[model samples]
Target: ATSSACPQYVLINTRGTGEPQGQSAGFRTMNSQITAALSGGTIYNTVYTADFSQNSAAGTADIIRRINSGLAANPNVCYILQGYSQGAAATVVALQQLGTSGAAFNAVKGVFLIGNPDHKSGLTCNVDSNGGTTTRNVNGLSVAYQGSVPSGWVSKTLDVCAYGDGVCDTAHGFGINAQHLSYPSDQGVQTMGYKFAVNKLGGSA
Candidate 1:
């Protein structure tokens, strides 16, 4: 897409609904933490209209296109995909669209999601921001569309849902409670996300 060589890694950030066209609040902190903890990476926001009515299909396509173009520029470039709320749904669908194989899939080093609507029960990737199992068995509000992460992606994915996040932990969400909106400033969430990305990118957090 540009003349310069691609970064060694790209951190793709997808924001939630009602958020401005940039990294969501919680994701913004996580993005900064990840970038600070690691080197040779840059942030890329998936450009799309994040709204309630249409969900984030446009964001999904943007995520895929970004990766494709990055790979085209430099085959060795890797990615750490981070999504929040509506953006999480988009990221999940993007993985499904990319399937379990090929360059796009291969280039992905890690996937981190917060407050995802496509969360499903009983996946090894399920965990709350505190690194607890409280949200493991609950299915997200939109589980029907994305189902589970593709088997191949399980090990590389970390789906973090707050204990009472109505979007991902619907069984006890109580309808978009404080926890749903707390991820951005939550220290535990940022630390876990930063650690995940750092560890995945050949660095120690």
Candidate 2:
């Protein structure tokens, strides 16, 4: 749907800790790819301090609040959520808070997460950076944060934890190894993110 208040779809991205105040690297590439493949849409970076505090609670709030405003302006506006590292963890919590009903939940078409410390095990949403099954059953670093993708939102989410990435795939990883840092530059990961969004939005990849 097209409207003056909202574009056809909006990509809400939450950047990693210590990253600059902008779209995270992998999200940037995926956003570009999605824009090129589809028509009119916008990108919004969640405004929050990406620091070591409350596990990105500010970001979690911002994500849910941002969607609230957008849907208020245009109820038909669709959304795609993207996050990396700490941002990914925050986004997970936001999704939990968002639940699986109402306008805000229905408006969200897809979710893409990378290097999430809150990555849960054996969820159909889990996958490796390259869209492989290697990291599907692995758990992330923080055992304390045991959040997961709700079953109602499973088909709409992709939790990408690179195999052997210590942050997400703790079993095979060595505490923040090259794989964890590789999502931004990894063409495979970017391609997967782009494809997931496009597919969810009914666009050709």
Candidate 3:
């Protein structure tokens, strides 16, 4: 279950609905896209039908714990956390926890967030003029603050905001939307993810 390479890729699917059974189809589709995009890497899906319906914080924590447990047996493996919609939110939280824990998170090469909502704004689309930028307000603070990762851990964070899609754009105040879950349908994002992984994993992009 573990790879000997230091920069192995780990793909995670986010929670879109509380009903785990209902999410299987969507998860499968996302999985197919991810697998096809990152052909040679390992993918792990953290299923949480029950936990997702509760608080986002708890759900995110569960994912982090799972990632930690999985990697505990293979401490040297690096990761690339990728997610969509609710899964993206969970990924964000998990990354935050990893940063605070002082774990070897710098091993994470890149993070690809697709269709993520600005958890702080409660808006799902159109926050800026071009509908690309977003307002980072949340809980009287800013979601932008939470977006910062540990220094030297990741080379880049690719935040893909689909144009013309109200759900995953800046209009929602968060700059991304789960509504554009189909972003993976575009070959560009998939290619970018694959190339980024390849380059980070010590392969040619």
Candidate 4:
């Protein structure tokens, strides 16, 4: 007998800097990966991207509201949060709030943050979509996010940074600026990201 189909699994992508939400190349790739994971499952396209600045609470709250909207409509769906740059900072806030007080917090199972400005230095937590643990290095500096990640979020999240990306990794020397902007198209980043989603959304390791 054929296996039962899965419910709509929500994957949210928040763009960084001045970029529009859901239109970033990273978001586009993630959308493609997820769609392939569950052949015909409806992607729940009505959700809006949170277009807020990382410096303020607006960005964070914006994401929370949209996530709530999606979960409210699809009560049984699973979700994954993806954010880049300042948008990644927004995800940090969203998770902190949602994990504290929200219905869908438990529904969220996977997380991917790339070029996160809030990324802590040398702090890489890799959750193999394949099973078990894997450690990968993306350098970070002495300055970065000091906030607490959700209780178990570390285990489910795959955070990536370029060797010299100052956004996530602080640097006093000649840190690479282009690196921060490269995660979206980086072959390794995409490879792991695709595997990350697949591992979480279920199609492979």
The digit string of per-residue lDDT tens for model 2 on 7-121 reads 4888999998888988888688889988877776888899898986636888999999889998788777788999898888888888889998888888899999999888878
Cα lDDT tens digits, model 4, 1-205, are 1112235666666667666544456556656766676653333222234444336366667666666776778766667777776667767777777764457666676778776655653344632222222323323332234363555577777776655566665542134387677776776777777677766765664
What value does the lDDT take at residue 132 in candidate 3? 37
Question: Candidate 3 on 59-86: residue-level lDDT in tens?
Answer: 5766677567757866665666665556
Candidates' RMSD to native? 3.5, 2.5, 6.3, 4.5
Instruction: Report every candidate's CA lDDT.
Output: 0.85, 0.84, 0.50, 0.59
lDDT of 2 at 128: 88
* Lowest summed lDDT window (length 10), candidate 1: 1-10
Candidate 4's C-alpha runs over 4 A off are: 1-6, 40-53, 100-102, 122-148, 171-176
Off by over 4 Å in 3: 1-9, 18-40, 50-54, 119-155, 172-179
Worst 10 residues of 3 by lDDT: 122-131
**Model 1 lDDT at residue 82:** 91
* Pairs of colliding residues, candidate 2: none
C-alpha TM-scores of all predictions: 0.93, 0.93, 0.63, 0.76
Task: Write the candidate numbers in order of decreasing lDDT.
Answer: 1, 2, 4, 3
Task: Report the Cα lDDT for residue 138, model 2.
Answer: 86
